[PDB]
Amino acid sequence: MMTLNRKCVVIHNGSHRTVAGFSNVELPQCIIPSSYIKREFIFGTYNMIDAAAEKRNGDEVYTLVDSQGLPYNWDALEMQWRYLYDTQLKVSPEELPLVITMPATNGKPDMAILERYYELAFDKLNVPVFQIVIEPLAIALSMGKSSAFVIDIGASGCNVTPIIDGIVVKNAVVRSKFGGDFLDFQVHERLAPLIKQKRSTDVWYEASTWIQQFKSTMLQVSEKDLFELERYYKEQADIYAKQQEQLKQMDQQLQYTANNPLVQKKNFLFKPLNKTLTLDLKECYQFAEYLFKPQLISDKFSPEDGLGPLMAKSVKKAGASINISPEQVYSLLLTNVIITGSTSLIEGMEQRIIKELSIRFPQYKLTTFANQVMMDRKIQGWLGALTMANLPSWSLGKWYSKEDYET
Amino acid sequence: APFRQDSILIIYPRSQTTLVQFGLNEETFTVPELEIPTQIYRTTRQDGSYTYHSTNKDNKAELIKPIQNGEIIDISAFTQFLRLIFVSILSDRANKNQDAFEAELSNIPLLLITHHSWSQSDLEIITQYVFESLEINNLIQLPASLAATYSMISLQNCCIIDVGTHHTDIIPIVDYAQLDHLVSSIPMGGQSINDSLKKLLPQWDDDQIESLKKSPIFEVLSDDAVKNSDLEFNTFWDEKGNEIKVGKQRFQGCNNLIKNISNRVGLTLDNIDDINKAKAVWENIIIVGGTTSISGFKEALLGQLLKDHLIIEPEEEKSKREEEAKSVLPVPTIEYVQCPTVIKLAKYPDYKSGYSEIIFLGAQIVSKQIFTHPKFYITREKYNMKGPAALWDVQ
Amino acid sequence: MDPQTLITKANKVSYYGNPTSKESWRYDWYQPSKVEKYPFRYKTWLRNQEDEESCEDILDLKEFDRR
Ligand SMILES: Nc1ncnc2c1ncn2[C@@H]1O[C@H](COP(=O)(O)OP(=O)(O)OP(=O)(O)O)[C@@H](O)[C@H]1O
Fold it and tell me: Which coarse location class describes where this protein primarily resides (chain C)?
């Protein structure tokens, strides 16, 4: 749809995915990696994949954003926007309004960043006007929630932003470094023996092909603490073992060669070597467990850096940043919960989120929403920006113009 | 408001030649009547303005092919070319029927088959041109892929592999919707065979290679294969009439193309987010194009897809297991968590196999669908109010 | 006849609810009104409120008809 008789160019730069499109269509024109190749520049997946498989020397892969979710290379970002405009969108930057997303943060680099975007947008690309949207706020407002608790899990990590009455709590913003990128590492490292000082293109190809398949298929999230869960099933199995042995004690017999969900195996085909990879369900549970319990991987990391305590930490901090009562802020945050990001698509993640959050907050009743359309959840930030772009009046958001940029 | 099906105009511009049809018979299935080259002659003048002609008469001339690799390289030439066609059909009927303007040409709805690569800008211009310059009151801009699937009854999910001369399009469709972010195109096509054959037959003439490619002895054979596949040497007659003796190279040249297609289709469908949707797409594959008419091509491509992309227990592992199972005197099948479990070609229900055929079939059903209950396509009522921006009305 | 002659005569038909006016549009800048005016200009389709080329020869359909 065309609001105010016009269309907008919506762009979202994330750690992993970069989504660009028009505000009228409702589906994104393109989704490309948030990384790039240095030869010349190669910005497409298909374009990148070829360069990687081409296996040229002096080829490199660089992130386009710092772990904080902000762009750390502007000239590189400039080449991307040109590609987005010239290749995928096929429109001049001078023509249309630009709605882009930047992540929520506790600090105010925004003015440094805005000045950086002023140059990129205006003197560089001659963009007529543009708006910036806070991604969790975008996601929340788009969903009908004026106040919500947004858990965003992605390549960089878990980003938990509390929102009250339409504005973010800056102090209560928390960012884990555990997420899709961390999970990529563990899948590779753990499976290296089974497969039978690396080109960045080779690392990126593996991460974007067979590893991504592993996480979207093999990986699951326990509904409970894994140790606690494992001890339960073991003892439940011990009873079945003792039960079955006892029936042989009564009438006797000998060796008839006589139930634990954690031992069932999941089979993942590794096509490059055309060899099957097999892991029991417990080994699949293990990877995601590290997000809630990072201490297991290293001991360098504290239990509180885990997702479970962090969500609670954010909720507590949300109360302190408003000064109704802080104790009651919990009621509004836990009542409205938004689970988004691609990494939250791992099976059983929603339950564990509820489980871990319910433990530390037994008194409050809660209800969580997680978008059940698989694609939408991955691009949800961009869709949030899209609704903001499609707002009925210009008065409903901040727009930046050549007026704002001057000597 | 009033409409007679003989008035409906369907245009399907392609990179080389445009297919056009005027009217629908209602007795039978509609087939393209007119096949026109897609080109226009442009004489530049001192004014800085441009003039386009049907023929150059050896003057400044040049030639503008408005469509390259299915994309639109010249929008101005394309509209004039479109105009050329529209005016041409108007005169033909005008001369044949005196009252034509009062009856058949009274209202002419235009249905334009579009391409996935066409930009919003291009589509907006085309809309403006049809209503303003051509003075047409009804327009349907239909993507070919959605038109193609429309012929297939109740086909929600599928992947169209459209092999053109200089390029091949990969168009994944999900929930009756073209996913544009996953659509791609490879600079590989029917001509890649010519380029491939020229490597293995340097002594041959470019004319002779093409003649070999279209000859009956040119086919792509499965691993499983007085019949042609069996003898080492066979022969064909060129358009010149001369015999050309060719060896094993007649069965070659399509491998490089088929692999690149397969590889691209692999990544494309691997990025489908919902596996259950993705599984359906893999179960419906549409291989269409001119090149696909080559014998064994569809089978070779399908086979290559199953070769690399199919998820199934490796025969090497499965063999050891069956061998190890005995170990006895005098085996369970492996289950995988990935996609797909099975790969097969789209079934054509109730039907003839070409791309041009199915699109037009779809275009016919759409016309039945739109005109019965319109409330996609643009009407003069909207274009007057919204303008070329009327092209986008959704949500 | 002439192409414009063929275009102008064609597609002209009158029914109930049929628009008399043919509106024409242009792709140009626009300066949004305040709801004073906002200080930026963007490109969109605008309608000419006041109602304000190369025309070639027709073709022969049978030459380009099929066989
Ligand atoms: N189907 C899936 N199942 C599980 N994980 C997935 C799936 N698809 C992608 N991922 C993982 O999710 C991550 C991508 O996250 P996402 O696309 O949300 O990033 P982003 O939104 O661009 O960045 P951010 O989340 O920091 O804003 C990747 O690390 C990838 O491995």
Answer: nucleus
In the 3-class helix/strand/coil scheme, how is chain B assigned residue by residue? CCCCHHHCEEEECCCCEEEEEECCCCCCCCCCCEEEECCEEEEECCCCCEEEECCCCCCCCCCECCEECCEECCHHHHHHHHHHHHHHHHHHHHHHCCCHHHCCCCCCCEEEEECCCCCHHHHHHHHHHHHHHCCCCEEEEEEHHHHHHHHCCCCCCEEEEEECCCCEEEEEEECCEECHHHCEEECCCHHHHHHHHHHHCCCCCHHHHHHHHHCCCCECCCCCCCCCCCCCCEEEECCCCCEEEECHHHHCCCHHHHHHHHHHHHHHHHCCCCHHHHHHHHHCEEEEECHHHCECHHHHHHHHHHHHHCCCCCHHHHHHHHHHCCCCCCCCCCCCCCCCCCCCECCCCCCCCCHHHHHHHHHHHHHHHHHHCCCCEEEHHHHHHCHHHHHCCCC
Q: Residues of C numbered 30-49 whose beta carbons fall under 8 angstroms of chain B's beta carbons: which are they?
A: 44-47
Query: CA–CA separation, C64 vs C67, rounded Å?
Result: 8
Q: Please tell me the distance from the alpha carbon of residue B10 to that of residue B361, in angstroms, as a whole number.
A: 11
Going from N- to C-terminal start, the domains of chain A cover 1-135+381-407, 136-177+303-380, 178-302
Domain A136-177+303-380 sits in CATH 3.30.420.40:
yes
User: How do A17-22 and A30-33 pair as beta strands?
Assistant: antiparallel
Determine whether the interchain pair B314/A31 forms a contact, defined as Cβ–Cβ distance below 8 Å.
no
User: What is the DSSP code (8-state) at residue B129?
Assistant: I
Delimit the domains of chain C by residue range. 1-67
| CB pairs < 8 Å spanning A and B | 86
Q: Searching chain C, which residue's CA lies closest to the CA of residue A129?
A: C40
Neighbors of chain A by Cβ distance (3+ pairs < 8 Å): B, C
Q: What CATH architecture is A1-135+381-407? A: 2-Layer Sandwich (3.30)
CA B393 to CA B229: how far, in whole Å?
55
Could you tell me if B75 lies within 8 Å of chain C, comparing CB atoms?
Answer: no
Query: Nearest residue CA, atom 15 of ligand 1?
Result: A154
Q: How far is C54 from chain A (nearest CA, A)?
A: 27
Tell me how the structure was determined. Answer: X-ray
Whether B387 sits inside 8 A of C47 (CB atoms) is yes
